[PDB]
């Protein structure tokens, strides 16, 4: 429900998946908590979409 924005680049997608990439060259990254910043929420941003932001720490805590 929190709104994640790119730290840099743009959130883009193909027919099934969202990636974040630098504006001048397509090089899609997995959208993770290390790629986004959070500010405000989904009740405010117009055009916001529903997806999962990956947290690399979770599996490290479990492994």
């Amino acid at each position: 429900g929190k709104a994640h924005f790119p730290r840099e680049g743009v959130f883009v997608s193909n027919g099934t998946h969202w990636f974040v990439t630098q504006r001048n060259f397509y090089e899609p990254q997995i959208i993770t908590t290390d790629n986004t910043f959070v500010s405000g929420n989904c009740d405010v941003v117009i055009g916001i979409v529903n997806n999962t932001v990956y947290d690399p720490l979770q599996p490290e805590l479990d492994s």
Partner: protein
């Protein structure tokens, strides 16, 4: 559009870029998207007057 081939960008994202370019985080625009558009529209009307 003037860099070579033109690339389509939703207008509000062009603004997010422009705002980031002057030191303000690209979240300001969305929190204030309507405010910004309204101030803009007002300013243009003022110029014509």
């Amino acid at each position: 559009f003037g860099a070579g081939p033109a690339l389509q960008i939703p207008f509000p994202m062009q603004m997010a870029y422009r705002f980031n370019g002057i030191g303000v985080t690209q979240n300001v625009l969305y929190e204030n998207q309507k405010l910004i558009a309204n101030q803009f529209n007002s300013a243009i009307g003022k110029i014509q007057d």
